Design a binder for this molecule. Structure first.
Ligand SMILES: CCCCCCCCCCCCCCCCCC(=O)OC[C@H](COP(=O)([O-])OCC(O)COP(=O)([O-])OC[C@@H](COC(=O)CCCCCCCCCCCCCCCCC)OC(=O)CCCCCCCCCCCCCCCCC)OC(=O)CCCCCCCCCCCCCCCCC
Ligand SMILES: CCCCCCCCCCCCCCCCCC(=O)OC[C@H](COP(=O)([O-])OCC[N+](C)(C)C)OC(=O)CCCCCCCCCCCCCCCCC
Ligand SMILES: CCCCCCCCCCCCCCCCCC(=O)OC[C@H](COP(=O)(O)OCCN)OC(=O)CCCCCCCCCCCCCCCCC
Ligand SMILES: CCCCCCCCCCCCCCCCCC(=O)OC[C@H](COP(=O)(O)OCCN)OC(=O)CCCCCCCCCCCCCCCCC
Ligand SMILES: CCCCCCCCCCCCCCCCCC(=O)OC[C@H](COP(=O)(O)OCCN)OC(=O)CCCCCCCCCCCCCCCCC
Ligand SMILES: CCCCCCCCCCCCCCCCCC(=O)OC[C@H](COP(=O)(O)OCCN)OC(=O)CCCCCCCCCCCCCCCCC
Lengths: 606, 87, 177, 155, 99, 128
């Protein structure tokens, strides 16, 4: 007990210490990024001890260490929850973050604000571990809004660029639309269960939980970029490649999925919420993987990859498999951060070139990035016994063998084929073929920061699915009896996606020029969704923000009715009273009319 | 990363791309060989030369600047001014 | 259409710009280099077919339906250069492009760290302030009545003069500060 | 700045229109005001309602981030048509065709989710069988009461 | 056609002034003129002293208050021996062997 | 043949697909030259002050000050109460107030009617 809780809080305090070091500074640093990388590596090593002694016994606890505020029946405390979800996600997040920062010491080397960048990246890590370790909804909302604001500050890193600021404000807009549902859920739990703590929510076990689960699904739609609130995650690639690699692939964007996994005792007793999650996740993983088939920016393709995987996570929450969804989070982190790091190695080797149509011939020119990109693509598509096999295939085996929305399963399988299609699209246009990049070659990947940072996630993307899937305890019953067409479905659909997309790729060398169909323009212009919704919905607001509210009401009519009408009335009465001609005759004639009205008509003498 | 361009290196690369173009004989070409007067090329050929310059150095030359670079020394001076060489 | 020196685009300029936009969008459609090179020579032949057209109404009509051809056959995501407008690295370093006048606001203890640089900046500022009145009186003696007609500027006509309105062109920040 | 360079009332006579066009630094033939319905525009020019993204980006602007020159009469919704905001730029696909394709795709997907919810897939199995009266004490049943005997047999 | 002679002359003069400016942005070998200004201490200051502080804080201020560190009770199997009692948990009933 | 581009309010017509782009007529030459002259005169007037070494401050833009004065102070002196403004001020000013009034009033009447009949599940609701 004394070892577990101590090293638990040591991980968080150790992560906070470089923030105090960068805020209490005078000198130009003796490599502050190496200091933050050493700090996060040692926080990973420290966090492995509570993880291992969770694996030994299942030891969970709650550190409610600081009483913060008692609102009459709501005792809000600094309360940390060390259960299975924290004990597995915190080492995975720290390991990925350590890889991203040793990558960042190479990639962001020309940046004169590298200390600000490492400060912001560590602030993201602190807010994400406030999110994943929280016991009450207020502290989870602290971590929630914290990763949203660090997402803002890290998308809009190069702030003289208009599109970076636009993408960051877009990410804030969609996440606040999710925050509507999050604060809806907090309101429901406070008014109906008198709590924000997870324990009293789980122990009271409410039955009429339709509305708080709809709020949580809206919060996860905003945070995990589900359908309806998706385009901020492809817009979020405008930030630097460590930002897209750490935050917007593997660690931040799973927080809505992590939110719905965290509330699994309430989603397991609500079939309507499961159907909503299932249909929404299948819609998202269809739509984004369909959009990824025809994109040309490599970071856009990997962003649609990670949003398709988040849609798959929402699917496997929707089939009442929360622990397989969390296993897919922990699995997905390794190879998706590694695929973004390989893309960043390509982009820096080709002098900030991010388009796949100016690549090629990099099979031998960048051999280590080629190896790791192939291993990451096979872990993404579900090569057997790589890391993605140990969750995603099981997800398919649980999505087939369950009382399921059948259209959701069928779109999940079409998305599974599309994953193989865009993965070999990456491999074909980036690595295979012939060069298309400009003629002055500066191709070099021989920095030990780059090599070791890709290497540790490469060891992860080989072995971590095996190691985690054999260390975690059983929390469900795995379905392991199914017919042979149904057991082999994920592998066969993945191989068929590879075959069909190899046919599509071999037809690209041909001398046949077709005009593009409506299918291509629909897959390439993002389902037409940001072309409509980002032009129409701001327009209808902003004109209403100026023509209706600003000019018509609070500059004209609310100005007309109370002050201007009264002022004109008093002006008019003032000009009537003082328009006398100075004639003594008229004033005394008015006095006689006064006396006659007073006596005869008003009777003031009776 | 990012090797610095020089006037001699840009001149070598511009004349190198122009020596690989089969409508210019590489022995008549010099740094002041005007494309329409000395080399006798079409305006379409001048557009293709500027597009090959763009594919060579990796940055777009706008058309208001592309329709005025009429000798290779003008192209070298334009790439020099837009990339700030000899710092 | 919209140009600093000229009020318009000529018909020849419109044909050249459509040719370049068509080849860039064709390269976006025709990714590989040999396949692009084949279809680019075919498009060059299509532009060489109507090169010697003397009826300007017919040439303007052919340019118009060639624009409609291009608008039907454009790529939805064309290839944009990284520093071209619409690029991934476009206006990325604008947050690092601090103007020169901010060096005037520095403290003398942080100006003393670079003695030769600011001592050399002082003669640039002196050259600018002695050239300014000569180039203003050069601009007013050469601009026609009613104001200037185009946004072009004259060069330095005398020996010892600097070209008019030169400071924020010469002392602009670098592309990679 | 002084009085005769500020915006004023709606011009009706052509000399007032010409003085307004000279004030807003533009031609009389290009100077259209807003229609005089009394919304509070006055003599302000109806600029042609474009975003600033459509402006020529290779042109040397006085404000390169805004793509806007000094002295140029700004649009009434200039703060709205900045490049951080609403774009009017020409789209490769027609706007109505985009709306029809997106509405058809979303409506068809929601219809097929309703169909698959009406017709769900499942496995050729019975219910999952639990001991101790479908786990009566585990599911929160009170021990003072007694459930009816739920019995599962071998097959 | 390309440039006018006035445009060529202006671009040459601006180019010369620009190259002089960019050359004059270089540094001197004395510049920047600066004013005149334990192997595993990271494992001591950043790790071990926080383990000391946090262990003191949890032992004598947090666990001294009720329900602050609440641990899930450990998992009990048939065949275990309790440390606080010595009571051997009796093993399971004999299995109807399936294979 | 080819599908014609249909321009919209938020997706305008391209410069190259506009039939007035190909005007070689002398009146359009005069209009483009006069706009060029206005733009060049404003450009020269800007960059004489912009390149001044003696100037240290803000090159004031009377277009910008004029825009802010039209957006802020000119609205009421060029307002006329007529049919259009009265119907838009009643539709957008008191309309949503009436709407949210009846919505929240119906909701709270339903909720209060359920509470004082012992019907609303208010089992753990003690924070209010
Ligand atoms: C029940 C009977 C008894 C009740 C009490 C007495 C009745 C009168 C009401 C109270 C007094 C109101 C003012 C009376 C005088 C009018 C002002 C006047 O001189 O105007 C001319 C003149 C206007 O000409 P102007 O300046 O050239 O501009 C006009 C334009 O050119 C062009 O303008 P225009 O063409 O539009 O027409 C101008 C005129 C036209 O105005 C009208 O035609 C409006 C007439 C009244 C309309 C409303 C009637 C509503 C009846 C009630 C509802 C019925 C059912 C009730 C059921 C029970 C209740 C629900 O409007 C005005 O003059 C506006 C200013 C005066 C407003 C009067 C308000 C009356 C309120 C009635 C309440 C009842 O103004 C002046 O000379 C201003 C100086 C006056 C200073 C002296 C005023 C003294 C008044 C004393 C009255 C009480 C005697 C006290 C005796 C005891 C103490 C000693
Ligand atoms: C390196 C510098 C550190 C200090 C160096 C010197 C000390 C060395 C270490 C030895 C330990 C010192 C003594 C032990 C510390 C004090 C113990 C103690 O009982 O303290 C009294 C209390 C403990 O709680 P308490 O219950 O006794 O009292 C709370 C007060 N009432 C009851 C009125 C509500 O306070 C603290 O310990 C304060 C520090 C808490 C640590 C975490 C702070 C987080 C701040 C976040 C801000 C925003 C939060 C909002 C959300 C909250 C969640 C919903
Ligand atoms: C994993 C199992 C891989 C082996 C079993 C499937 C093999 C297969 O279907 O191969 C088909 C195909 C290669 O054959 P084809 O493209 O027709 O011919 C190329 C010339 N040799 O395509 C391939 O072999 C490429 C796709 C392989 C996907 C492997 C990861 C899933
Ligand atoms: C909600 C409450 C609504 C009413 C608030 C009071 C009216 C609004 C505020 C006072 C008037 C504002 C104002 O500036 O009005 C100007 C107008 C003309 O007055 P002038 O002196 O010419 O203006 C300054 C010179 N340019 O001034 C006038 O026409 C004179 C207006 C005087 C009004 C005094 C308040 C009367 C209230 C009681 C009525 C019975
Ligand atoms: C489980 C349920 C799931 C339900 C899912 C479906 C419901 C939600 C439907 C979608 C609603 C949100 C999407 C529409 C608004 C998107 C706004 C946005 O991000 O616009 C981006 C735009 C510029 O970005 P863009 O043009 O894309 O960038 C290209 C690079 N230059 O940026 C701008 O133009 C800046 C605009 C700033 C001002 C925005 C004004 C509009 C605000 C709209 C708020 C809507 C609130 C809805 C509340 C609902 C409550 C229940
Ligand atoms: C009503 C109506 O049609 O009023 C029009 C009238 C002026 O009529 P006009 O169109 O000039 O002939 O205009 C008037 O009579 C003046 C305004 C009539 C009352 C309008 C009430 C609502 C105003 C907006 C309130 C916002 C809060």
């Amino acid at each position: 007990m004394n070892l577990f809780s101590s090293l638990t809080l040591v991980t968080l305090i150790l992560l906070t210490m470089p923030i105090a070091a960068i805020n209490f500074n005078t000198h130009k640093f003796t490599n502050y990024p190496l200091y933050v990388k050493t700090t996060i590596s040692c926080a990973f090593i420290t966090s492995m001890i509570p993880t291992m002694m969770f694996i030994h016994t299942g030891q969970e606890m709650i550190i409610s260490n600081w009483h913060w505020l008692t609102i009459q029946t709501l005792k809000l405390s600094l309360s940390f929850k060390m259960d299975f979800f924290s004990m597995m996600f915190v080492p995975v997040a720290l390991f990925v973050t350590w890889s991203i920062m040793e990558f960042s010491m190479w990639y962001m080397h020309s940046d004169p604000n590298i200390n600000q960048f490492f400060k912001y990246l560590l602030l993201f890590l602190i807010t994400m571990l406030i999110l994943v370790t929280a016991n009450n909804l207020f502290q989870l909302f602290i971590g929630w809004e914290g990763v949203g604001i660090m997402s803002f500050l890290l998308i809009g890193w190069w702030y003289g660029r208009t599109d970076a600021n636009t993408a960051a404000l877009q990410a804030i807009l969609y996440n606040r639309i999710g925050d509507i549902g999050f604060i809806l859920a907090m309101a429901w739990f406070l008014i109906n269960l008198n709590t924000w703590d997870l324990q009293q929510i789980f122990m009271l076990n409410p039955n009429d939980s339709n509305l708080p689960l709809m709020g949580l699904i809206l919060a996860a739609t905003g945070k995990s970029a589900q359908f309806g609130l998706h385009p901020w995650l492809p817009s979020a690639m405008e930030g630097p490649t460590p930002v897209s690699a750490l935050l917007h692939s593997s660690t931040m964007v799973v927080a809505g999925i992590f939110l719905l996994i965290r509330f699994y005792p309430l989603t397991e007793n609500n079939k309507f919420g499961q159907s909503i999650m299932l249909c929404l996740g299948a819609m998202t993983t269809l739509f984004t993987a369909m959009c990824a088939l025809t994109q040309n920016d490599i970071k856009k393709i990997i962003a649609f990859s990670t949003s398709s995987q988040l849609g798959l996570m929402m699917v496997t929450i929707g089939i009442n498999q929360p622990h397989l969804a969390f296993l897919h989070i922990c699995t997905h982190a390794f190879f998706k951060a590694m695929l973004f790091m390989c893309s960043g190695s390509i982009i820096h080797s080709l002098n900030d070139e991010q388009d796949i149509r100016k690549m090629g011939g990099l099979f031998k020119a960048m051999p280590f990035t080629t190896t790791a990109l192939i291993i990451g693509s096979l872990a993404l598509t579900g090569m057997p016994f790589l890391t993605g096999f140990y969750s995603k295939d099981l997800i398919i085996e649980s999505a087939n063998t369950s009382y399921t929305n059948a259209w959701a399963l069928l779109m999940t399988l079409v998305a599974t084929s599309f994953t193989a299609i865009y993965s070999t699209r990456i491999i074909f246009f980036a690595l295979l073929g012939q060069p298309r990049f400009p003629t002055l070659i500066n191709i070099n990947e021989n920095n030990p920061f780059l090599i070791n940072s890709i290497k540790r996630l490469l060891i992860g993307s080989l072995f971590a699915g095996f190691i985690i899937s054999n260390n975690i305890p059983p929390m469900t019953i795995p379905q392991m009896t199914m017919p042979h067409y149904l057991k082999m479905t994920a592998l066969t659909v993945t191989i068929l996606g590879f075959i069909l997309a190899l046919e599509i790729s071999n037809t690209t060398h041909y001398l046949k020029f077709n005009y593009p169909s409506n299918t291509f323009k629909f897959s390439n212009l993002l389902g037409y969704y940001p072309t409509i919704m980002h032009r129409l919905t701001p327009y209808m607001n902003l004109t209403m923000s100026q023509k209706s509210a600003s000019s018509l009401l609070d500059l004209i009519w609310l100005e007309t009715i109370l002050p201007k009408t009264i002022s004109l009335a008093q002006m008019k009465m003032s000009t009537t009273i003082t328009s006398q001609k100075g004639l003594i005759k008229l004033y005394f004639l008015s006095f006689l009319i006064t006396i006659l009205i007073s006596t005869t008509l008003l009777n003031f003498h009776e | 990363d990012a090797p610095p361009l020089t006037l001699e290196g840009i001149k070598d690369r511009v004349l190198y791309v122009l020596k690989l173009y089969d409508k210019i004989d590489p022995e008549k070409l010099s740094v002041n060989s005007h494309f329409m007067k000395d080399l006798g090329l079409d305006s379409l050929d001048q557009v293709e030369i500027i597009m090959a310059m763009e594919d060579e150095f990796g940055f777009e030359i706008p058309d208001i600047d592309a329709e005025k670079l009429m000798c290779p020394q003008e192209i070298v001076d334009y790439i020099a001014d837009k990339k700030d060489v000899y710092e | 259409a919209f140009l600093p020196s000229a009020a318009y685009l000529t018909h020849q300029q419109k044909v050249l710009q459509l040719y370049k936009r068509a080849l860039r969008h064709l390269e976006s459609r025709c990714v590989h280099r040999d396949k692009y090179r084949y279809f680019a020579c075919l498009l060059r032949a299509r532009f060489d077919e109507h090169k010697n057209e003397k009826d300007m109404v017919k040439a303007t009509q052919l340019l118009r339906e060639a624009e409609k051809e291009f608008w039907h056959g454009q790529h939805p995501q064309p290839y944009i250069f990284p520093e071209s407008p619409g690029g991934t690295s476009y206006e990325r370093y604008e947050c690092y492009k601090v103007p020169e006048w901010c060096l005037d606001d520095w403290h003398p203890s942080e100006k003393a760290m670079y003695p030769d640089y600011f001592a050399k900046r002082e003669q640039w500022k002196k050259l600018r302030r002695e050239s300014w009145e000569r180039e203003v009186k050069q601009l007013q003696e050469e601009t026609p009545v009613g104001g200037p007609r185009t946004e072009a500027l004259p060069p330095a006509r005398k020996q010892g003069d600097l070209p008019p309105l030169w400071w924020h062109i010469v002392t602009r920040p670098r592309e990679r500060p | 700045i002084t009085k005769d360079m500020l915006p004023g009332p709606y011009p009706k006579t052509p000399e007032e229109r010409a003085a307004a066009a000279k004030k807003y630094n533009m031609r009389v033939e290009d100077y259209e005001p807003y229609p005089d319905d009394g919304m509070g525009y006055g003599d302000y020019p109806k600029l042609p309602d474009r975003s600033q993204q459509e402006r020529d980006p290779w042109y040397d602007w006085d404000h390169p981030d805004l793509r806007l020159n000094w002295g140029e009469p700004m649009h009434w919704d200039l703060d709205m048509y900045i490049r951080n905001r609403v774009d009017t730029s020409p789209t490769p696909v027609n706007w109505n065709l985009m709306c029809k394709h997106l509405f058809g795709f979303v409506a068809f997907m929601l219809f097929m989710f309703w169909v698959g919810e009406t017709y769900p897939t499942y496995q050729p199995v019975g219910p999952k069988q639990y001991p101790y009266n479908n786990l009566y004490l585990e599911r929160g049943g009170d021990p003072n009461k007694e459930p009816e005997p739920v019995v599962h047999y071998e097959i | 056609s390309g440039y006018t002679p006035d445009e060529k002359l202006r671009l040459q003069q601006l180019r010369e002034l620009r190259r002089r400016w960019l050359k004059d942005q270089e540094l001197s070998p004395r510049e920047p003129v600066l004013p005149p200004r334990r192997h595993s201490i990271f494992a001591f200051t950043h790790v071990l002293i926080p383990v000391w502080i946090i262990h003191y804080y949890l032992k004598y201020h947090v666990t001294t208050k009720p329900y602050t560190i609440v641990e899930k009770k450990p998992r009990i199997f048939p065949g275990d021996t309790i440390l606080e009692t010595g009571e051997v948990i009796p093993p399971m009933k004999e299995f109807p062997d399936q294979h | 043949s080819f599908p014609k581009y249909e321009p919209s309010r938020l997706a305008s017509l391209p410069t190259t697909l506009d039939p007035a782009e190909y005007d070689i007529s002398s009146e359009t030459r005069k209009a483009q030259a006069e706009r060029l002259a206005i733009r060049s005169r404003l450009k020269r007037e800007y960059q004489l002050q912009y390149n001044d070494p003696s100037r240290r401050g803000v090159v004031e833009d009377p277009a910008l000050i004029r825009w802010t004065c039209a957006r802020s102070a000119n609205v009421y002196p060029n307002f006329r109460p007529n049919t259009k403004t009265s119907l838009l001020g009643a539709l957008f000013g008191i309309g949503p107030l009436i709407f949210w009034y009846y919505v929240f009033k119906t909701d709270r009447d339903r909720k209060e009617k359920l509470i004082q009949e012992g019907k609303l599940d208010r089992t753990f609701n003690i924070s209010y």
